[PDB]
Amino acid sequence: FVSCPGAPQPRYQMNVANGFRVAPVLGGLTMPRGITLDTRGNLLVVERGRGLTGHTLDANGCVTSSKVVIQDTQINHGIDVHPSGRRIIASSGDIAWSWDYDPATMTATNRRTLVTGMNNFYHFTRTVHISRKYPNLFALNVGSDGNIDVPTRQQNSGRAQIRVFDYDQLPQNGVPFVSQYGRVLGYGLRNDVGITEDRAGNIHSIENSLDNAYRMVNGQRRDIHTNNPAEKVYNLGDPSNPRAIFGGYPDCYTVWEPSDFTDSPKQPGDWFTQDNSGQYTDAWCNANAVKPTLLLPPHTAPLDMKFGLGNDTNLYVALHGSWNRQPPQGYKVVVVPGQYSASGEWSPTAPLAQSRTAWSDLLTNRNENQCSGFGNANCFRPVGLVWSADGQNLYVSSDTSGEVFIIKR
Ligand SMILES: *[C@@H]1O[C@H](CO)[C@@H](O)[C@H](O)[C@H]1NC(C)=O
Ligand SMILES: [Ca+2]
């Protein structure tokens, strides 16, 4: 394999790990965000500002036709297909809806309002993940309204958190996100756009963390934002038994670079607070917040993640790239090694404190330090991931370049 019929050349140089090939399958798209495959293996793409588009594939995974499945200018990121193949869920910043779906024609009908009231203008994506282990359940993310959204200390804020809803008991008129119907799976999660599940059905989420981090040292604010805090994954466990795991936001953050803490011995993965004073101290965080399972580099902006299939026991993560770092970093897809327990729970191979060097590049730009999150990007910016059912093809969207790629084994 070299390329797909009729497909454009890539907008930017693209490097993929030895053993794989990459090529565009689509270009000229409108802000492609979340992507998935339906039960016929068709590609569905949220083109933010246009709607959900559907694309039939050939034997090589290349596109043979394109249509508009949902004509809607508000759906902005989230998409998932129910395991039955006959229902889809997609969301605006404010509302999650379902549609009846016919994969034979890629046709969505009978829009139904599920969950309401979620809008904010700061973190406005509403990731959807339908549980495969419990197909009546679905999770929705609402990120913080601001860098440091103090009300998110409370679950009932409705932000920086993931709730799980029982579709099969959901009122047909739909319900507010903050309601008894939305069981809090995790809160204190600043912006957890990527959500997936392991073979045991545990929900794993990944986070975009704090901007412009500082640390108070001797009553003076020390800028530590270049290399802190870490981006990070949480294992939120069983969505049929939600218990409101607290991830530490808006007070507690995760160390990436210990050297920045000149008066406090830290290791990667430890908690820190910016002021380390009052109630919400480093020690308070250790007693009251649950640690992540793995780290990724500051500001790299994970937006999706997916486990490998078949023989592959890795985690794959789309890093959209930074804006709040110089030089910039991310703008890639990475691989995190892991393993499954006897009952199917995924964990990383590296200990948390050793995880800074555990991950590897899969798909990269020419030079991440030449990319930018301000002005022209000069780079593709990964958003969404999905594996083909055979585990042989990994699709990757890039919103700002209008592209979807195929990575082929
Ligand atoms: C998975 O199997 C393929 C052959 O089908 C092989 O080439 C590859 O080494 C295997 N990978 C792992 C991680 O065992
Ligand atoms: Ca950030």
Residue numbers in the entry: 241 to 649
What does the literature reporting this entry say, word for word?
The enzyme, pyranose dehydrogenase (PDH), from the filamentous fungus Coprinopsis cinerea (CcPDH) of the Basidiomycete division, is composed of a catalytic PQQ-dependent domain classified as a member of the novel auxiliary activity family 12 (AA12), an AA8 cytochrome b domain, and a family 1 carbohydrate-binding module (CBM1), as defined by the Carbohydrate-Active Enzymes (CAZy) database. In the catalytic cycle of CcPDH, electrons are transferred from the reduced PQQ in the AA12 domain to heme b in the AA8 domain, which acts as a built-in mediator and transfers electrons to a heterogeneous electron acceptor. Therefore, CcPDH is thought to be involved in the extracellular oxidative degradation of the plant cell wall. Here, we present the crystal structures of the AA12 domain in its apo- and holo-forms and the AA8 domain of this enzyme.
The apo-AA12 domain crystal used for the high-resolution data set diffracted to a 1.5-Å resolution, and the final model was refined to R and Rfree values of 10.7% and 13.4%, respectively. Since molecular replacement using the first diffraction data set was not successful, multiple isomorphous replacement (MIR) was used for the initial phase determination of the apo-AA12 domain crystals soaked in the mother liquor containing Pt, Au, or Hg ions. The asymmetric unit of the apo-AA12 domain crystal contains a single AA12 domain (residues 241 to 649 of the full-length CcPDH) with 1 calcium ion, 1 formate ion, 1 sulfate ion, 2 glycerol molecules, and 778 water molecules. A polyethylene glycol molecule is partially modeled as a triethylene glycol moiety located close to Asp601 in the apo-AA12 domain. The structures of the apo- and holo-AA12 domains are almost identical, with the C-α root mean square deviation (RMSD) being equal to 0.77 Å. In the crystallized apo-AA12 domain, the calcium ion-binding site is completely obscured by adjacent molecules in the crystal symmetry; i.e., Arg606 of the symmetry mate interacts with the sulfate ion, which is a calcium ion ligand, via two hydrogen bonds. This crystal packing arrangement appears to prevent PQQ binding, which explains why soaking PQQ to obtain the crystallized holostructure did not succeed. The soaking method was not successful for obtaining the holo-form structure of the PQQ, most likely due to the way in which the apo-form of the crystal was packed. Therefore, the holo-form of the AA12 domain was prepared in solution and crystallized under different conditions.
